[PDB]
Coordinates of N, CA and C in Angstrom, one line a residue:
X1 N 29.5 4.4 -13.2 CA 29.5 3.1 -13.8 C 30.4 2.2 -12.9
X2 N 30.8 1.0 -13.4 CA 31.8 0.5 -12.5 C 32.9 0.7 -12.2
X3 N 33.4 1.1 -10.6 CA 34.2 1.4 -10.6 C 34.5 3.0 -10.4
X4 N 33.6 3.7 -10.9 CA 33.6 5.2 -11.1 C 32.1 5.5 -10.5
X5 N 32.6 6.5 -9.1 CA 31.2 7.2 -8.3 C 31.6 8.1 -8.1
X6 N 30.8 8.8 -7.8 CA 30.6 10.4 -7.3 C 30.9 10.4 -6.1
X7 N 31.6 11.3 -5.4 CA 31.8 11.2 -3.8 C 30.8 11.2 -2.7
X8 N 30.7 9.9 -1.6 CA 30.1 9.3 -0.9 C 29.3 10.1 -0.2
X9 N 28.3 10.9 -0.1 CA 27.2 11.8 0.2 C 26.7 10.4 2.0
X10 N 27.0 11.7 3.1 CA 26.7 11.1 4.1 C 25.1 10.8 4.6
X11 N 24.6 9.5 4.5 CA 23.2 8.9 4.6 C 23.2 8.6 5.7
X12 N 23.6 8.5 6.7 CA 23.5 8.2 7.7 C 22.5 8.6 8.8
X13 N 22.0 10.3 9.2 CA 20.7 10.7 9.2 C 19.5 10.4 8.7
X14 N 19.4 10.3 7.6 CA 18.4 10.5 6.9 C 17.2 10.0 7.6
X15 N 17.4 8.7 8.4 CA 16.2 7.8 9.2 C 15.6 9.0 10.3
X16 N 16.5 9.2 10.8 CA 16.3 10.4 11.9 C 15.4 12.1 11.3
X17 N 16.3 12.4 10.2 CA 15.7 13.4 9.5 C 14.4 12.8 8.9
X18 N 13.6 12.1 8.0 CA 12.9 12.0 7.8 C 11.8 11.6 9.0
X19 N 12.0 10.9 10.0 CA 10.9 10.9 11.5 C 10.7 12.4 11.7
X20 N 11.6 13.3 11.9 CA 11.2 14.4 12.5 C 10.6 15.2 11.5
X21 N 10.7 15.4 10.2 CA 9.7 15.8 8.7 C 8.3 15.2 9.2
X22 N 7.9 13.6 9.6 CA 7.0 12.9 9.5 C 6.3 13.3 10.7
X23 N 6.7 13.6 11.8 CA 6.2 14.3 13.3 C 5.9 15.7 13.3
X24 N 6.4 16.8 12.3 CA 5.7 18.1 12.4 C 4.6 17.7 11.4
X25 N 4.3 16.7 10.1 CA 3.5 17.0 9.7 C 2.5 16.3 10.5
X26 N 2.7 15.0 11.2 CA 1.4 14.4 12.2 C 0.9 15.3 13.0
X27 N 1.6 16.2 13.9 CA 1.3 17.9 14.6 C 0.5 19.1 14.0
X28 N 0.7 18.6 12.8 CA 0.1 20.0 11.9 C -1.6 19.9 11.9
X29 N -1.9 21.5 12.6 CA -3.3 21.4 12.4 C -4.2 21.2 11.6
X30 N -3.8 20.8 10.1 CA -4.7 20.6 9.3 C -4.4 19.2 8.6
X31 N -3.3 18.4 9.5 CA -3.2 16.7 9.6 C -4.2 16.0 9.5
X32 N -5.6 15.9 9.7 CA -6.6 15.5 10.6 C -7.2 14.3 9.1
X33 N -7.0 15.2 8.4 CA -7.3 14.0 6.7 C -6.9 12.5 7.1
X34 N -5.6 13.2 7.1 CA -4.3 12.5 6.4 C -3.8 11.2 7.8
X35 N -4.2 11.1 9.0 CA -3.7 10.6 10.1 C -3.4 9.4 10.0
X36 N -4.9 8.6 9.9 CA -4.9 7.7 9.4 C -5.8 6.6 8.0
X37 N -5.7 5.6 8.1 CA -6.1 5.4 6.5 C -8.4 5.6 6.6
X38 N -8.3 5.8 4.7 CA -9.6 6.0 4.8 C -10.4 4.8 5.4
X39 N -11.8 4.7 5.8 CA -11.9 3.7 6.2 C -12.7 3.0 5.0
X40 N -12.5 2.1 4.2 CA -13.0 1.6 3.1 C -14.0 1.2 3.1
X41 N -14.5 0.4 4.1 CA -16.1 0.1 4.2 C -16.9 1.3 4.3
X42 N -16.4 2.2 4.5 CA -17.6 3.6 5.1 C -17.2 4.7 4.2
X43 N -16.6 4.2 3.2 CA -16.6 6.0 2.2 C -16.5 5.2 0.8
X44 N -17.8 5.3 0.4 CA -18.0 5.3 -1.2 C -17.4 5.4 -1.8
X45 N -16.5 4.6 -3.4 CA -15.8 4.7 -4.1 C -14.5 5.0 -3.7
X46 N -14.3 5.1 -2.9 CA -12.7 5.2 -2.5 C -11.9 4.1 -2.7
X47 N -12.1 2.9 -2.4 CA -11.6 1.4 -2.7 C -11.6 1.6 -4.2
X48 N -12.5 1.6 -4.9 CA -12.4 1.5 -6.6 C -11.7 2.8 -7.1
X49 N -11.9 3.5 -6.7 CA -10.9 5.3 -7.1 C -9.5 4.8 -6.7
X50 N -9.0 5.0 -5.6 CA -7.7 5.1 -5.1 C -7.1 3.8 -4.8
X51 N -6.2 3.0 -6.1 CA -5.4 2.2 -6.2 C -4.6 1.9 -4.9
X52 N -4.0 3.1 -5.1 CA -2.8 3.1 -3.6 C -3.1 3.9 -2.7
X53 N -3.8 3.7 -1.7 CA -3.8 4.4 -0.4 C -2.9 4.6 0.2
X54 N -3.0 5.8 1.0 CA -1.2 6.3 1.9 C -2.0 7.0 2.9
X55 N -1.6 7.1 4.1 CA -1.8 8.3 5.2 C -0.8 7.6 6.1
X56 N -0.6 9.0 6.8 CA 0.8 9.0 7.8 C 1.0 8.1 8.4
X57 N 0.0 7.3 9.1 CA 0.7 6.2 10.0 C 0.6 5.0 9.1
X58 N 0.3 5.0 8.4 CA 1.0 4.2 7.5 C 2.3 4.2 7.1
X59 N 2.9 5.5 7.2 CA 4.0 6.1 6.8 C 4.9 5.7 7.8
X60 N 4.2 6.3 8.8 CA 5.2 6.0 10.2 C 5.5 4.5 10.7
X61 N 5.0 3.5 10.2 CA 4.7 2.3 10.4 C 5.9 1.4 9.3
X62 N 5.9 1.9 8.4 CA 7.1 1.6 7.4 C 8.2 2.3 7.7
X63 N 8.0 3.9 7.4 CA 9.7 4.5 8.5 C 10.3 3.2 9.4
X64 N 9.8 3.0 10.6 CA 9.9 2.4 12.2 C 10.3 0.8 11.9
X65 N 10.2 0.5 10.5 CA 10.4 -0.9 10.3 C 11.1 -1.1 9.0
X66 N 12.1 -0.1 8.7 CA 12.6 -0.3 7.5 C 12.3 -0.6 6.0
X67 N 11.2 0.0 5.9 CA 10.4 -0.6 4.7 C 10.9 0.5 3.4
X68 N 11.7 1.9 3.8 CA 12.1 2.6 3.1 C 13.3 2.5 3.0
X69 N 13.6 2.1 1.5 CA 15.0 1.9 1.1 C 15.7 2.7 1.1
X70 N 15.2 4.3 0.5 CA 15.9 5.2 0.5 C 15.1 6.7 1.0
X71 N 15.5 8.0 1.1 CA 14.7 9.1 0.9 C 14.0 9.3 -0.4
X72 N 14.2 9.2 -1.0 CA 12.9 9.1 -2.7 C 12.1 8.6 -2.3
X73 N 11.9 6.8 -1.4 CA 10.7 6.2 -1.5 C 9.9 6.9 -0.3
X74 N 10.4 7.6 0.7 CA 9.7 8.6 1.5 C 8.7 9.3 1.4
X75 N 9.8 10.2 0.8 CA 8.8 11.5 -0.3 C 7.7 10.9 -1.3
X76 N 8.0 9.6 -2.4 CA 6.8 9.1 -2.7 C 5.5 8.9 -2.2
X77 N 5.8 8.0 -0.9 CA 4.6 7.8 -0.2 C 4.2 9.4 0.2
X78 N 4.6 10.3 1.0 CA 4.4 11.7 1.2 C 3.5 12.2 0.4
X79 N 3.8 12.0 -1.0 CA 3.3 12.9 -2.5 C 2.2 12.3 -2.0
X80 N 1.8 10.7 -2.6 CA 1.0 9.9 -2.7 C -0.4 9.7 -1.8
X81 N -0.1 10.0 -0.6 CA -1.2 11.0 0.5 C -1.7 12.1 -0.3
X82 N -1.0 13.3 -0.7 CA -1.6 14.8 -1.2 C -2.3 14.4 -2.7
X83 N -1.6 13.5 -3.7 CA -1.9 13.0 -4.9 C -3.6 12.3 -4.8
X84 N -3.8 11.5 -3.6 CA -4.8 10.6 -3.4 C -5.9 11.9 -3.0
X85 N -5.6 12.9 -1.9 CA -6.6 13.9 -1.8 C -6.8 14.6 -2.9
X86 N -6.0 14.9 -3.7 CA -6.8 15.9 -4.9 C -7.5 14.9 -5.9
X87 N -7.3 13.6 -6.1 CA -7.7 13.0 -6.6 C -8.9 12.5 -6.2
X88 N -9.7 12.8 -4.8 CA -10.8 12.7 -4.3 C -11.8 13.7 -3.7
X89 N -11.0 14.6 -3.9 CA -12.0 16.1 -3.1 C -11.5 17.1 -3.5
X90 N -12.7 18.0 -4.0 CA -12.5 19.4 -4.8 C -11.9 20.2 -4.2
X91 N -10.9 21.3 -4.6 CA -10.1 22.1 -4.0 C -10.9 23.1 -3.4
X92 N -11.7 23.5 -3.7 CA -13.0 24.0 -2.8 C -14.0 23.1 -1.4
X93 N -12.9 22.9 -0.7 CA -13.7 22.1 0.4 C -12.3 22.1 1.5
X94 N -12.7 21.7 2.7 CA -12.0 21.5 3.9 C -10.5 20.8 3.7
X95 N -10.8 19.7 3.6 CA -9.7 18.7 3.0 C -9.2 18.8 2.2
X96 N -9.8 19.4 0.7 CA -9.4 19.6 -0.6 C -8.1 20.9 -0.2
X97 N -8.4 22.0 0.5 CA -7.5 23.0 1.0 C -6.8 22.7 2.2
X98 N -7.1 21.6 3.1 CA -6.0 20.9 4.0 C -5.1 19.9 3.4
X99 N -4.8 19.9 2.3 CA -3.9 18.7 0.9 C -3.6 19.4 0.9
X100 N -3.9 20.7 0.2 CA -2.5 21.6 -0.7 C -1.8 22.2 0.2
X101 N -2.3 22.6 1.7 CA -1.4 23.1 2.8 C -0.6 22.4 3.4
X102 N -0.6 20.9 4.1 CA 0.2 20.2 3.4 C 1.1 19.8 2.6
X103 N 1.1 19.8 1.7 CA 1.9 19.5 0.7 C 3.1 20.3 0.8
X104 N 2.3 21.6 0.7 CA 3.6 23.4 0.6 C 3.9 22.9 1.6
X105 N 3.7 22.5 3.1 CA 4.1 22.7 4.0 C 5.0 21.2 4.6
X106 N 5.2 20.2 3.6 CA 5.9 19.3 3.4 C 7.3 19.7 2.9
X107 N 6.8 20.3 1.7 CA 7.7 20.3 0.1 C 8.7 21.1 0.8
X108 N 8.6 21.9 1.6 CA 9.4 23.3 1.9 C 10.5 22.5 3.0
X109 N 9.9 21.7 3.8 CA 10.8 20.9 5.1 C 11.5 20.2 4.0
X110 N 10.7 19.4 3.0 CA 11.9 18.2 2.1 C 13.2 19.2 1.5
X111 N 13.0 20.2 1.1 CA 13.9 21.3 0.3 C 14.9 21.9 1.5
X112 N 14.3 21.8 2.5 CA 15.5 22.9 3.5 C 16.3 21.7 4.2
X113 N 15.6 20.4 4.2 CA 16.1 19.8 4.8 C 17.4 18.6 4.1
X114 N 17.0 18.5 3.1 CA 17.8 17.6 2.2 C 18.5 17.8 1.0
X115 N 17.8 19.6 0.5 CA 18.8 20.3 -1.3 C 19.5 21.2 -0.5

């Protein structure tokens, strides 16, 4: 409250640690969904389905320009990429099992890298 905090946890990385999270997943072989955004004119219902679109360079585009206030809003957009694939492709298909690999293979760098 005012006046009364919890001792000053150093943020100063974090810009740097979260680029290098955002560059093994652009690397990762099964990236190839997620690179960049859908293209709305050429894939059916996607504009009316998916409110909020995310893919990485979108991601990396706001990283590079301060658009993330903190690590929370990172990992949101992060989710929000794997959230939009399951929300569009059966888990029985290419992409539908390049999302969830992904994701594990996000969640594990956010956990080692930041709890």
């Amino acid at each position: 409250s005012m006046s009364v905090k919890k001792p000053k946890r150093d943020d100063s990385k974090d810009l740097a640690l979260c680029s290098m999270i955002l560059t093994e997943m652009e690397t990762h072989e099964d990236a190839w969904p997620f690179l960049l955004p859908v293209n709305l004119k050429l894939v059916p219902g996607y504009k009316k389905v998916i409110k909020k679109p995310m893919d990485f360079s979108t991601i990396r585009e706001k990283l590079s320009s301060g658009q993330y206030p903190n690590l929370e809003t990172f990992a949101l957009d992060v989710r929000l990429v794997f959230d939009n694939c399951e929300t569009f492709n059966e888990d029985d298909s290419d992409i539908g099992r390049a999302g969830h690999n992904m994701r594990k293979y996000f969640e594990k760098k956010w956990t080692d890298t930041f709890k």
